[PDB]
Symmetry: C4
Subunit: 197 residues, 4 copies
């Protein structure tokens, strides 16, 4: 009904823009596939729907929509449920296509990612590359150091991620200081397999 | 007419989102009841309507819509009417359901609440719990200390509240410094029945 | 056509809100009259229309819409036309009703006003009250001192004003420092007829 | 279809506003011509379309839409493609009419421009005026000095520009410090033909 019509109407607008700007069909297709994998044919207004609810109801809905992501992630599964809820509310859903570069080395990161579904390559230049999958996260090192990306991260497949900005990261750890160490440990651990400590 | 249609059309959108995300009927019902108690079947655009009026007209409307809340509250009833008007303009209407946690201990509060209608439990961990009702307020302690919630507050029933952010709190007291003491007194008084002073 | 329909449709929404909140007809009328005097039956989207034009075109339109206000005001008529244009772009149109209080003493002003059309009383408590009309401005003292309103200002009639915020005030004088003195002179002059210097 | 209808509907609104404010046909025409040259009869919602895509897809689209601008500009053609992409994302499309003043001397610039198509006169008061065309840029001096415009710049013809704000300028050079010198060189070089060094 109203959701499907909101999508096909918006996809329509997108299909016109591509034509006006005469984009390569090499590109229009990526755009088309992105739209499928991101919306599945139904477009809502989360900002509006969720903005119109009380905070307790948002937390109940968000905790449910992410119950599976939470169950796969050691960081959460054993944490205070209020820490978890406080992080889920600050995350933003992002989809990434096979080949896409989620993060670039040398760059100045301002956000991290939690993998809901998909596989990503951590090409840490030189050698000793790595793969992370569902339940893992990355991009935290810059949120702690405030330096530059230690590696690059490329979608091997369609990824569903949840990003968290440095602002929201520090705001959560301000409230739950205990949980910083959980991040530090995995960070310094990851830096050891490279150059950091 | 246009208000009712705006509601049932928006509630429609909400009912779809719930289905797409396959929420427990245990949850869909809470959402449904929330929507009833919050909108009563008519949805307006306060930001637009009120934004389109002069400041004097907003104050006249807001003072009238809150005349009853003002009459129940000792803080206001005896204060400079301009202090009162200046606070009413900064408040935000919030509804909370039976059982909901309005505030959590240990947490870093950034806003307080004034009860228009309803009853809330101040479970101050340990013992000596308390009940506040229509005309009372809470959550001011963190606005003064800038520390953490001294207790938890749970809706015993459907609550209608008006929240005030720390920013707007300090902005009002900047203009009406005399009124800080009224808040301090009730605060230090509340801290005594616990641990504060 | 589209403008008139946008107004009567929005006024419709306003008429419903008043009914829902059961406002005194003493108030609904003020609201109704305000809407007439502010929109004249046609509602546009300045933010959209003007936002869609180049800066030079905005300045040309704004200079024309305010040519009469500019001609009545000694501050402008003899100033660099670029100073003038730079001020006009930052102003915001405001209508005020007979009896309305535009400014209150003791209060912390963050904006000034230029009278396009109407008469206002500067009731400086005590005695020696004053009247300002088309082409005059007021509320500058707090923009300079950063203190409190030295008097109150009440609409004797329907006023059409243009307000300027302290931010935009200081931003203009940052570019045209010479013009501060023009404001200071009238300010210190106004303070002398009271208490300031 | 939907784009053309969005334009002619919005142009309609514009044509009414002009009439309501009784603008000189000397002005209505400039407005009309501006609208043609800026939209070409089709209006989209870039903020919405582009906001709904992943960052990698935006970069792919933006790099393509600006491939020609990039090919004409020595600054880019030889730079790290990621520096280039990082600048393109921050630019804003602006059209300017024959005679328009893009920049005024003595003024406090907060943005620079890259010429996609058109010719502009750098009237540096006094004497020794200059012309810049497709592929050139200007307005960088204030982004570096944080002072005032060294000259004025006037559209000799319809210009298509891309502006970059001081905020985005410093944010890019923060990530790609090497590229500051490329700007400094052309800047100090331009200052020499005048007064700067
Ligand atoms: N050896 C590794 N194993 C897994 N993830 C890594 C490794 N090295 C770096 N990363 C992740 O890659 C990210 C690149 O951006 P950050 O430096 O902010 O954070 C880095 C880590 O989260
Ligand atoms: N003994 C008490 N009686 C009533 N209210 C209380 C009592 N103790 C705490 N509160 C309220 O509970 C709030 C919890 O958050 P705050 O600490 O910011 O502010 C606290 C008070 O407003
Ligand atoms: N004697 C006066 N004559 C005219 N205007 C005045 C006089 N005294 C005060 N005002 C205006 O009234 C304003 C009240 O707010 P401000 O103090 O910011 O600025 C003040 C002046 O602009
Ligand atoms: N001699 C010149 N040749 C080309 N461009 C110039 C010259 N002098 C000034 N400009 C440009 O004109 C701009 C005016 O604003 P800015 O001072 O910020 O930056 C200046 C330069 O980019």
């Amino acid at each position: 009904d109203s959701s499907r019509r909101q999508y096909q109407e918006k996809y329509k607008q997108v299909e016109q823009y591509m034509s006006f700007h005469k984009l390569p069909p090499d590109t229009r297709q990526r755009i088309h596939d992105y739209y499928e994998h991101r919306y599945q044919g139904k477009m809502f207004d989360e900002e509006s729907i969720l903005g119109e609810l009380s905070e307790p109801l948002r937390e109940e809905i968000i905790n449910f929509n992410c119950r599976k992501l939470v169950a796969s992630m050691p960081l959460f599964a054993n944490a205070d449920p209020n820490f978890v809820t406080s992080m889920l509310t600050k995350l933003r859903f992002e989809v990434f296509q096979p080949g896409d570069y989620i993060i670039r080395e040398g760059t100045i990161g301002k956000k991290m990612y939690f993998i809901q579904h998909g596989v990503v390559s951590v090409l840490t230049k030189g050698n000793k590359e790595t793969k992370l999958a569902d339940g893992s996260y990355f991009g935290e090192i810059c949120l702690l150091t405030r330096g530059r990306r230690t590696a690059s991260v490329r979608a091997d497949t369609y990824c569903r991620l949840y990003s968290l900005s440095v602002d929201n990261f520090n705001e959560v750890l301000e409230e739950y200081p205990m949980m910083r160490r959980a991040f530090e440990t995995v960070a310094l651990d990851r830096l050891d397999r490279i150059g950091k400590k």
